Paper text:
In the methanogenic pathway from CO2 and H2 studied under laboratory conditions, low-potential electrons for CO2 reduction are generated by a flavin-based electron-bifurcation reaction catalysed by heterodisulfide reductase (Hdr) complexed with the associated [NiFe]-hydrogenase (Mvh). Here we report that under nickel-limiting conditions, in Methanothermobacter marburgensis, F420-dependent electron-donating proteins (Elp) are produced and form a complex with Hdr. The Elp–Hdr complex uses F420H2 for the Hdr reaction, fully substituting Mvh as an electron donor module for FBEB at lower nickel concentrations (<50 nM), at which Mvh production is not detected.
To further characterize the Elp–Hdr complex, we performed cryo-EM analysis of the 1-MDa fraction. We obtained structures of the ElpABC–HdrABC complex at resolutions reaching 2.2 Å. Cryogenic electron microscopy (cryo-EM) structures of the Elp–Hdr complex show that Elp interacts with and can transfer electrons to Hdr. The architecture of the electron-donor arm, containing ElpABC, is similar to that observed for homologous subunits of the FdhAB–MvhD within the Fdh–Hdr–Fmd supercomplex. These conserved structural features strongly indicate that Elp subunits functionally replace Mvh subunits under Ni2+ limitation by providing electrons from F420H2 for the FBEB reaction that drives reduction of both CO2 and CoM-S-S-CoB.
Residue numbers in the entry:
A (entry chain B): 1 to 284
B (entry chain C): 2 to 184
C (entry chain a): 150 to 576
D (entry chain A): 378 to 565
E (entry chain c): 2 to 93
Write the structure that this text describes.
């Protein structure tokens, strides 16, 4: 199987360990990850979608055409990038006039959006294309960890369009986490936003850090050993915002933040240096 | 004094019907059939810690209080978590309306400097979060390339991104000046 | 045109229709799928807006039905086939095996006292228990016992203790064939199941109940002897919340209609809780208060003024179970324009009304069309509310759509008149 | 057409609960049909004159009947009728004969003064003129709202305590046409 | 920053039931039966030139938000003109 590999910004530019773990995991699963040469910001929906829909849609459509050139579906492991690309894809596919406008903009770049590929999420690809049994076969180091699963807002919502799992009480990520031997611990307001989406992190850092502080308070009361996410934007929020919360209010949580790919790599006995824990601000 | 003769009453002078018609025509028509149950506000995590009230935003959009909406700082408290939209009993596309209102506000000049900085980063390097030297070293150490195979590595891709930005007028929107490469 | 009628459903609407037809001189059959007649009216403790005892007024009509010379009552039976047309309906009914002889059983209840197997009682709506052999409630008509073979172990103690020899473990389903001229469908409704409303946590949170369960609990003859008790620890709740429009006016679940009665019975049950427990705090979360009927607005004002029941205009966003099993309702007060997170010892969901189980099978058997809400459709929404486009078939009660007792009774009487006209004419 | 000039109004306001749910006039009951016929007439005005703006001032929207909630939603989705949750404080006639409705928008939590070319009062239902004379002639009792009293509120809605005398329709209290027709058939 | 952790949510900590009982026992019994129609606020002349909202004062008194009421400057904007009381459909 072949799939185009979209990287985004935060993963490749702040946390390369997630990227390396994903590459190793997909090599072990016999899935060929094809680089999307010349890919850019998806662009981050929080700022660009809030500023100008046309620009956001055009940049996302160019990113989609990069993969369309290779005739491969796009695979993303960021909830923000998945949301942006998927929304642009299903907006252009189902709207002829908007497609014509975006193609008029794209013309000067020597590209045209055809609506020929699909945008897919990393967890969804793992659950459907691989399956829990083959994920389980590859586990060599069954983990002993109590983890708090942070789904992120844009993995499952808007569910009417994504139709992956129930947004109120989903179980896909919990199952993918538990095939590793770790235990997904229920905690209060589990489906709550981390506070970084919608451009709030850069607009009002205090509000986003309050989101994160509430989530961390709930997670700590449940006893977790770590936070597991499928969004480098949520990953960055938790990691950097724990330090910011300590600096601003002197509150210590010391809850390591792991991407789902990193957890799978840990359960699959990947080399430690491949996880690139040095990138994380919170010591793991 | 508590006196203020304009802030405490709504007349036709505060209403812009063209704003409401524009919002509905641009994909926020569902806001027409909000019956103001308040489920969205109860579900809103930002409404619990800020003066942001999404239900009142929907109501103002329906009424046509443009100046009250676009100039409102609380409009930027929405994280687009979609919690409200999943639970709306009238199936209103709340997040779509919020984003359209934010677009109108940006057109009116209510853009925060940090968001403009993110836009300028995208313009200059194609990445909202461009790579730094430490991450380059980390990438090299772990077997990955020094640069990701993105606009960081391909100047022509960055030129295409800049062409797209120029075509849509995004550079003018955030006041990016190509000559000096500043805002 | 045959001068015999068939009434399907033994609720208040069906009881009224059958009694009206019998008093007009027509031989009537009544078919009821449950062991006893009464419908949902028999499960209520009181009725709004008068707070009068429901059973005290329903039981005489049930007795009248049970002892009427012009009525043949066939309980624990289902209509299997309907063929023919107006005046010429051939109906095949199957009487399910009670394993108890209706002619011999006196409903004394000794077999119940001696039975060793416990099983849920359908009359208690999943919060009350009975034995494998049971009588649904003391005022049942016919007052006869029923054995559920899904739970019977065949220990034969009931046979030993029965003095009338009414126990029949070898009973078989019976086939009945009747000829009628008119049919009145009065099959009522079921309460909406709020399990799918995951945010409110029904079926997960311990102290979240429905309105009908509260009706059974507050009933003096209910499983708790009329005491409102927390399911978690069996103690009285000091704080109770009511949530309106659960399963209604909600496009997220495909229920865009009003259930038309939940506001009133929510207020009634809040008033009853206050009467029994004056120190309890009762709060209602509503979108609109639909007190439209006669004396309903006064009932609402009485709820606020005499009982001090609190009204919050806001559709709750979520119900969160705290570690101690208390429940936090997170909801906007839209009139204060602010989010509130209030704690309660019990939460009651004002569930709506849905068509009953097996409605589609009966609708296809008769051949009727259904309205957009899923209930049976009438010939004309304005001038023929109890008629159907199938000649000789009529609707009465909630079978045609949600409504309260007096509306259902008026519809049943009107259906009796409309069905009698063709039978009086005779051609 | 406007009573003042013979010209079509461009702005129309509807006021709910006029003569109902009001202890200031001794009318503490709901008239049960004004919400629905207000919405119906707003929809009809929109159908005939699509450019007209229609606003309804309501306390509760009592769309309880069959298809009534769908009708309520259709009033907004299809015809674009505006709903303001607020019982108007006053109607002021301006020199040009337009009308300013002064009312709180309770969901915005702010006072509004909106101008309209026509204002329609959602008047309730009362017993007909000469009702007391006929009631005394027959010898029937009346309920607290002034309408005739049924024998039993729950199980005898069309009977009276006077044997051989029956009630049908709004004589027993406000209601819509299908309910009155069902009551008439039951009384028969 | 727009962050404010206490002003934008109501819990049992913001509620003083004894205050509501005291006001009701002292002659404010009728506030128990407000239906929040908003006629009072629409009638209020100080409501359309100041942030004073009489209906919200009645609601807060019913709920028991003592601190929000007693410390509110707008509480002193009422001229006692009695228009709201004259027009209240619930006779509050
Ligand atoms: C919690 C609650 C509280 C309420 N409180 C009040 C109140 O205080 N006052 C008031 O006026 N109204 C009240 N109502 C409404 C009231 O219950 C209904 O208006 C009334 O019960 C309708 O009677 P019915 O005979 O039409 O239907 P039902 O009461 O549902 O009776 C229908 C009958 O048909 C039977 N049946 C179903 N399917 C078949 C079949 N296929 N074959 C044969 N028989 C069948 C049923 O088992 C039942 O015996 C309340 C409702 C609820 C849910
Ligand atoms: S949840 Fe939907 S219907 Fe309710 S107030 Fe919000 S947008 Fe309006
Ligand atoms: S999407 Fe915005 S308005 Fe809706 S719940 Fe999330 S933060 Fe609140
Ligand atoms: S079956 Fe026999 S013992 Fe049981 S109630 Fe009937 S008569 Fe009594
Ligand atoms: S035979 Fe069946 S019904 Fe009778 S006592 Fe035994 S278990 Fe109960
Ligand atoms: S009657 Fe009241 S509670 Fe029931 S659905 Fe209608 S508005 Fe909601
Ligand atoms: S039906 Fe509506 S408008 Fe008429 S009295 Fe009742 S609430 Fe008021
Ligand atoms: S007029 Fe009376 S009922 Fe209406 S909001 Fe004011 S005090 Fe409450
Ligand atoms: S008395 Fe006058 S000033 Fe005071 S709240 Fe009432 S209307 Fe307003």
């Amino acid at each position: 199987m072949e799939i185009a590999y979209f990287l985004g910004c935060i993963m490749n530019n702040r946390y390369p360990g997630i990227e390396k773990a994903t590459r190793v995991l997909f090599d072990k699963l016999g899935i060929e990850l094809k680089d999307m040469e010349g890919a850019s910001c998806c662009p981050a929906p929080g700022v660009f979608g809030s500023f100008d829909k046309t620009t956001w849609a055009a940049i996302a459509a160019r990113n989609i055409t990069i993969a369309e050139d290779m005739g491969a579906d796009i695979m993303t492991e960021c909830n923000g990038c998945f949301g942006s690309l998927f929304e642009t894809n299903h907006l252009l596919k189902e709207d002829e006039e908007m497609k014509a406008k975006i193609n008029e903009i794209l013309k000067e770049t020597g590209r045209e959006y055809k609506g020929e590929v699909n945008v897919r999420h990393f967890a969804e690809v793992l659950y459907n294309d691989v399956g829990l049994d083959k994920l389980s076969e590859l586990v060599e180091k069954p983990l002993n960890l109590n983890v708090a699963v942070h789904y992120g807002c844009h993995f499952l919502k808007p569910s009417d369009e994504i139709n992956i799992d129930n947004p109120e009480r989903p179980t896909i990520l919990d199952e993918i986490v538990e095939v590793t031997g770790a235990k997904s611990v229920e905690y209060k307001d589990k489906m709550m936003c981390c506070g970084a989406g919608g451009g709030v992190r850069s607009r009002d850092l205090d509000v986003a850090l309050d989101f994160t502080r509430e989530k961390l308070t709930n997670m700590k009361e449940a006893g977790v050993d770590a936070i597991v996410n499928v969004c480098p934007f949520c990953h960055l929020q938790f990691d950097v915002g724990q330090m910011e919360i300590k600096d601003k209010f002197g509150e210590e949580f010391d809850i390591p933040v792991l991407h789902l790919a990193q957890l799978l790599g840990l359960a699959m006995g990947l080399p430690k240096e491949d996880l690139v824990v040095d990138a994380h601000q919170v010591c793991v | 004094t508590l006196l203020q003769r304009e802030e405490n009453i709504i007349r036709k002078g505060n209403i812009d019907k063209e704003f409401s018609e524009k919002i509905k025509a641009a994909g926020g028509d569902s806001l027409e059939y909000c019956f103001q149950c308040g489920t969205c506000t109860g579900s809103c995590p930002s409404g619990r810690r800020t003066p942001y009230r999404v239900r009142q935003i929907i109501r103002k959009a329906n009424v046509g209080l443009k100046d009250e909406i676009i100039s409102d700082p609380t409009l930027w408290m929405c994280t687009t978590c979609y919690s409200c939209q999943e639970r709306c009993p009238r199936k209103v596309k709340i997040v779509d309306v919020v984003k359209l209102a934010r677009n109108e506000a940006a057109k009116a000049g209510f853009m925060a400097p940090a968001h403009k900085a993110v836009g300028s980063f995208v313009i200059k390097t194609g990445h909202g979060v461009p790579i730094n030297d430490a991450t380059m070293e980390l990438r090299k150490a772990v077997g990955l390339g020094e640069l990701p195979p993105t606009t960081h590595q391909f100047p022509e891709a960055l030129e295409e991104v800049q062409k797209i930005i120029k075509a849509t007028g995004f550079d003018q929107l955030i006041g990016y000046n190509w000559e000096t490469g500043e805002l | 045109v045959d001068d015999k009628a068939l009434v399907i459903g033994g609720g208040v609407a069906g009881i009224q229709a059958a009694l009206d037809l019998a008093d007009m001189g027509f031989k009537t059959y009544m078919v009821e799928k449950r062991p006893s007649i009464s419908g949902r009216m028999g499960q209520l403790d009181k009725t709004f807006p008068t707070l009068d005892c429901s059973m005290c007024i329903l039981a005489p009509k049930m007795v009248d039905v049970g002892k009427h010379d012009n009525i043949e009552l066939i309980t624990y039976a289902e209509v299997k086939e309907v063929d023919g047309y107006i005046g010429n309906f051939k109906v095949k009914i199957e009487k399910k095996p009670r394993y108890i002889d209706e002619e011999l059983c006196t409903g004394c209840g000794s077999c119940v006292e001696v039975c060793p197997i416990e099983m849920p009682n359908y009359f208690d709506e999943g919060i009350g228990m009975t034995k494998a052999v049971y009588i649904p409630f003391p005022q049942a008509v016919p007052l006869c016992a029923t054995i559920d073979k899904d739970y019977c172990i065949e220990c034969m103690l009931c046979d030993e203790v029965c003095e009338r020899g009414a126990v029949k473990h070898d009973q078989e389903p019976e086939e009945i064939e009747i000829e009628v001229g008119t049919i009145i469908v009065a099959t009522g409704y079921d309460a909406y199941d709020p399990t799918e409303k995951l945010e409110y946590g029904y079926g997960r949170h311990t102290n979240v109940i429905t309105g009908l369960e509260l009706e059974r609990m507050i009933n003096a003859s209910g499983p708790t002897d009329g005491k409102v008790l927390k399911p978690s620890d069996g103690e009285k709740p000091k704080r109770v919340a009511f949530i309106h429009c659960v399963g209604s006016r909600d496009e997220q679940i495909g229920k865009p209609y009003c259930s038309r009665v939940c506001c009133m019975y929510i207020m009634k049950n809040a008033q009853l809780i206050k009467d029994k427990m004056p120190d309890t705090e009762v709060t209602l979360y509503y979108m609109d208060i639909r007190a439209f009927g006669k004396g309903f607005e006064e009932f609402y004002k009485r709820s606020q003024e005499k009982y001090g029941i609190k009204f919050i205009r806001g559709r709750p966003a979520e119900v969160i179970e705290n570690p101690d099993l208390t429940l936090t309702v997170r909801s906007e007060d839209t009139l204060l324009g602010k989010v509130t997170e209030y704690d309660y010892d019990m939460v009651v969901l004002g569930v709506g009304l849905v068509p009953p189980e097996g409605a589609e099978t009966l609708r296809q058997t008769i051949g009727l069309s259904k309205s957009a809400d899923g209930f049976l459709m009438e010939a004309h929404p304005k001038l023929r509310p109890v008629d159907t486009l199938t000649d000789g078939v009529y609707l009465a009660g909630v079978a045609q759509g949600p409504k309260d007792i007096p509306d259902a009774v008026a519809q049943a009487s009107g259906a009796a008149a409309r069905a009698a006209i063709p039978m009086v004419k005779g051609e």
